[model samples]
Structure formats: structure tokens, C-alpha cells
Target: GIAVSDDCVQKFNELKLGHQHRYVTFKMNASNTEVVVEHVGGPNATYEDFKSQLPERDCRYAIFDYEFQVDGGQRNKITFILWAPDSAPIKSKMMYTSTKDSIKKKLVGIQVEVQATDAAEISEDAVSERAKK
Candidate 1:
């Protein structure tokens, strides 16, 4: 469900948006038949957190570190370097359910490129839908 073409990534770049830091457990939920991406505060279990006043499902989930920063302008964009498979099933689910919102957020952000890593361009056809609005 990850929109990885041009528009999605471009929009994130344009907005200078992204998660300050991230750690996720990409697992599939057998009961729901859906992929699960629970945000963890860090790579270890010593630290943990949750967003305040967020939508909650029966699923465990969004334990990210750092907050969205918009003070430095577009140059602040962070390349969220991935060290795993780009096609991992849970990754897609995370992108589908989360990334779109940050790109479209009236709030904070997620999935960025702060490093000079392999940050591929992402696109979304949904932008046309926005124009029609």
C-alpha cells in the first residue's frame, strides 16, 4: 500500500516533512489478516511511548521517537533510510496507513530522508482527487 512513485515522495520533500526517528516491528496479524507496524520508541524495550489523543484500534501500534519539525523550512527534510527489504509486507501496510497522513497532515510527520541514503521518489494518484475537491 506504500505509494512509491513520484508524487508521494515529492509531496513529502516539498513539505520538508518526516519522522524525527523511527523503529517498527513489521509483523502480520493472523487474526485480522492485515500487516501490523507498531511504532517503538527505540530498538530496545527499555523505552516506549504513544501519541496523545490518537485513534486506537485493537491493534498495538506509533511508538516513534522525535517529533515533526517545520521550523527550518524545506531543507529540514529527513531521509528515512531503510536497512530492510523495500517490499516487506508490513512496510507496505505502514505506508498505506501512516505515511499518507503525515504527507497530508494538519498535524506532524513521518517517513523522511535526513541522510544521503537511497531515498527513492514516491508518487500518489490521489493528488488528482485532491484537485477535484
Candidate 2:
């Protein structure tokens, strides 16, 4: 029987456990694996932590078979991959609006600039504020 080892379980637990109200179930078989997370709180629980928990495998693949729900209502099917070290990390964002004509938008972004000379001195922007009316 194939099973996730204790170390894998520990690693999963060590990853940041989100505060949002949610429940997760993990299943594994000889050929297939599944994880289901249900958000019971408000509209905040996300799958980011779950994705982060995945082991950094050398090969990349897609998560195709799964579903998500909130408040017993079907949400959306998420597709993602565990990126390789040699490649740049990708960032994806999505937005939706409700109106007479609903609007759906998605943006795919990536950051791969390698500034070797300034990498050591450069620091991430810690604070930025939006202009108020």
C-alpha cells in the first residue's frame, strides 16, 4: 500500500496553518491522490497554503481532478503546478464582479529578472499605501 510517509505528514503540518474556518481531507491510492478543503467561515479561506504544502518535486504536473465549494455552493476548479527550481515563479490573480452583465477577469504575471549585481543590496518594498479620496 502506498502511503505518505511521516516526514511528509510532518512537513505538511509544519507549513503555516491558516486561520480561516476550513476542513481538509487527504486521500491517497496506488495511482491517484486527492485533497478536499471546504471553507465554512466567510469568503476568505483560500487554497494557497495547500499548494505551498506540496513537496517540491523535480517534475512538474497539473492538478486536474478536484472541486471546491463554499457554503454548499460550488466555487471553481483550480489548476496549478509545482514549479521547478530553474524556472521563474508565476503569479496568477483573478477577479469577478456582479452586475447586469457579470464580469470575469484573470491576469497571469511572472517575475524572472535576475539582477545578480544588485541582488544582495536590493530589498523588497515593505510598505505601500493606496491614495485616499
Candidate 3:
């Protein structure tokens, strides 16, 4: 089952650290959930500058896996926010359960989209590569 309103809010707040932005919003629908971050703290920085300034945190890894469990059901989303702050913004890849071992099996109908802000600089090649396995 999907997370209820309170559970979703709590999870969103927990994931809101190191985000130097004024508004961070998370939205969920029947098909997907998205995290939109807004930065009104100061002038928007270039992608190069933002990438260079990324904090040395675990979330800063070039590639990482995120698992979300809601009401005993599991789902996974892989994020490539490394090139965020670039022209392309951030992208998220998600997989849903399809079988008994679906949690460990990646599905084929994943979706990707640009983030809310056009405050990043991601090259076409980089974005293309990220779309592949």
C-alpha cells in the first residue's frame, strides 16, 4: 500500500537535509511520487559550481540505490541527482513489484522526468547515459 499523508510527510521531512532551498515538496499519485526542490535562498548557481560544491555526504555518490517500504510492500528508485543544478535538472528512475521476487527484479516500464527547477547544467550525453542500465 502507498504511504498515508502523515507517513509521507514525515519521510519527506527526513529527506530534507542538506537542501539549501526554501521549499521542498513531495508529491505522489497512483503511479509515481516526485520530489521537487525549490531554492529561493540566493542566486541560482551554475551546474559546474553546484557539482563542485556538493557536500561530501553519502547521498553525493555518483550512483546509489534507494528503497522505500510502505505498509509492508517494497519499491525502489534510483536517483541520479549528481548533475543537478545543471540545465537539465534532476532525474529519478523507479521500479515496481511485479512478481513474488519482484522487489529484487527491475521492471521495464520505468519513468523519468526533469525536476521543477531549470537550475542545473546536465549535458545531453550524460542524460542519455543515465537512461541506460
Q: Each model's RMSD to truth, in Å? A: 13.9, 15.9, 16.1
Error of model 3, residue 123, in angstroms: 23
Please give the TM-score that candidate 1 achieves against the real structure: 0.22
Tell me how many residue pairs clash in candidate 1.
Answer: 17
User: Distance (Å) between predicted and true CA of 9, model 3?
Assistant: 34
Error of 1 at 51 (Å): 24
- Model 3 segments more than 4 A misplaced: 1-61, 86-133
Put down candidate 3 lDDT per residue, 55-94, tens digits, no spaces: 3321221211233455789643333333222322123212
Q: Evaluate residue 91 in candidate 3 and report its C-alpha lDDT on the 0 to 100 scale.
A: 30
Q: How does model 3 fare in lDDT?
A: 0.29
For each candidate, the alpha-carbon lDDT, in order, equals 0.31, 0.24, 0.29
CA shift at 78, candidate 1, in angstroms? Answer: 6.3
Which regions of candidate 1 are displaced past 4 Å? 1-22, 37-39, 43-108, 111-133
Error of 1 at 38 (Å): 5.0
Candidate 2 accuracy as lDDT: 0.24
Q: Model 3: clashing residue pairs?
A: 85-120, 85-121, 86-120, 86-121, 87-120, 87-121
